[PDB]
Amino acid sequence: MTVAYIAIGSNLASPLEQVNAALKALGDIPESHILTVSSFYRTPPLGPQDQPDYLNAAVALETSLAPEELLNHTQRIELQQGRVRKAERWGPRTLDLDIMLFGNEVINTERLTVPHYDMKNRGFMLWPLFEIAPELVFPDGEMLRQILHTRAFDKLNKW
Ligand SMILES: Nc1ncnc2c1ncn2[C@@H]1O[C@H](COP(=O)(O)CP(=O)(O)OP(=O)(O)O)[C@@H](O)[C@H]1O
Ligand SMILES: N#Cc1ccc(CSc2nc3c(=O)[nH]c(N)nc3[nH]2)c(F)c1
Ligand SMILES: [Ca+2]
Ligand SMILES: [Ca+2]
Ligand SMILES: [Ca+2]
Ligand SMILES: [Ca+2]
Ligand SMILES: [Cl-]
Ligand SMILES: [Cl-]
């Protein structure tokens, strides 16, 4: 088994409902168990700002799936919760499940890049992660606590 850390976002179609439904679906992933769920945070949108605020959260998922098999399931869950691809870059969505980390693994396949390429720059990923995994060390040895101590991130508010 490995512990994967999954970021959750939603800003459409009742985010609290979407995220609660997603937690139920994440539990139903085979070869996998949720270990820890963060608080839910209400975050202003980064990138395009002409969209509703996000509900962001993080989950620790123990799994024996292959990394791309986990991606298969997270993509399925997003699609089954009505995620629709629009042309605009970084538009709003009913559900977004980003695989932040997959153990200590560095993965670079056609479909999957882990660690998530920008997570170390995103408070809405790092703060819920720290809530559930304060002792976390990245594959490159960087400590989560040190990033959050040293770098300026805006304070997050709970949902
Ligand atoms: N760590 C990861 N977690 C989830 N999907 C990933 C991934 N690494 C690569 N992908 C790929 O990312 C593709 C595009 O996903 P999108 O959800 O449209 C990007 P986004 O989440 O809106 O932006 P972001 O990656 O800047 O957070 C997926 O189809 C998937 O194949
Ligand atoms: N500068 C910036 C910047 C640009 C694009 C993205 C990726 S699109 C996106 N996803 C979320 C989310 O989950 N939460 C919140 N708050 N804002 C979001 N924006 C980004 F993150 C930051
Ligand atoms: Ca827009
Ligand atoms: Ca994302
Ligand atoms: Ca995504
Ligand atoms: Ca190739
Ligand atoms: Cl959507
Ligand atoms: Cl890393």
One-letter-per-residue 3-state SS of 85-139: CCCCCCCCCCCEEEEEEECCCCEECCCCEECCCCHHHCHHHHHHHHHHCCCCECC
Closest Cα to atom 10 of ligand 1: 112
At what resolution in Å was this solved? 1.1
User: Does 50 participate in catalysis according to the annotation?
Assistant: no
Quick count: other Cβ atoms within 10 Å of Cβ 98?
18
Annotated active-site residue in 76, 89, 93, 140: 93
The answer to whether 76 is a known catalytic residue is no
HSE-up of residue 155 (Cα within 13 Å, Cβ side): 2
Residues with Cβ within 6 A of ligand 1?
Answer: 71, 90, 96, 98-99, 111-114, 116, 118
Cα 148 to the chain's mean position, in Å?
17
What's the CATH number where 108 sits? 3.30.70.560
For 110-123, b/e burial (b = at least 16 CB within 10 A) is: eebebbbeebbebb
Q: In degrees to the nearest 10, what's the CA dihedral of 71, 49, 130, 38? A: -70
The two structure tokens encoding residue 153: 């991130």
Q: How far is Cα 111 from Cα 30, in angstroms, rounded to an integer? A: 20
Whole-angstrom distance, CA of residue 87 vs CA of residue 121: 25
CA–centroid distance, residue 98 to ligand 1 (Å): 6
Of ligand 1's listed atoms, the one at least distance from the Cα of 9 is 21
Q: Which of 28, 42, 89, 98 is catalytic?
A: 98
User: In sequence order, what are the beta bridge partners of 62?
Assistant: 3, 33
- The whole-angstrom separation of Cα 143 and Cα 159 is 27
Q: Which of 12, 69, 71, 121 gets mutated to test ligand 1 (max ligand atoms within 8 A of its CB)?
A: 71
What whole-number distance in Å separates Cα of residue 38 and Cα of residue 134? 11
CB 7 within 8 A of CB 125: yes
Catalytically annotated residue among 42, 76, 83, 118: 83
Could you tell me the residue range of the domain that residue 149 belongs to?
1-159
Question: What is the count of structural domains for the chain?
Answer: 1
Q: Which of 79, 101, 95, 128 is nearest to 19 (CA)?
A: 95
Q: Which two tokens stand for residue 15?
A: 């985010």
